[PDB]
Amino acid sequence: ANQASVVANQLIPINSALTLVMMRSEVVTPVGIPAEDIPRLVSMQVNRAVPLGTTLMPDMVKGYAA
């Protein structure tokens, strides 16, 4: 409905630090990390490969807590 999540704009390899080109905002279901937090995600690492178009979930980001 109106809440957007962070979605991978490219494949993100396992253990890569997130950069802004990697993250778009889209209204997807199920809901993942709120698109509002994209600034705060830069430089944090993902703990698994995230294919293009996959919603980024809290458990995929090392050290994420919000």
Method: X-ray
Q: Is the Cβ–Cβ distance between 31 and 9 less than 8 Å?
A: no
What one-character-per-residue DSSP string does the chain give? ----EEEESS-B-TTPBP-GGGEEEE--SS--SBGGGHHHHTTPBBSS-B-TTPBPPGGGBTT---
**Number of domains observed in the structure of the chain:** 1
Task: Retrieve residue 10's tokens.
Answer: 């490219």
CATH number for the domain that contains residue 49? 3.90.1210.10
Q: Which resolution in angstroms does this entry have?
A: 1.8
Give me the phi and psi of 21, to 5 degrees please. -65, -20
Q: Tell me the residue range of the domain where 9 lies.
A: 1-66
36: left (phi over 0), alpha (psi -120 to 50) or beta: alpha
What is the Cα 46 distance to its own chain's centre? 9
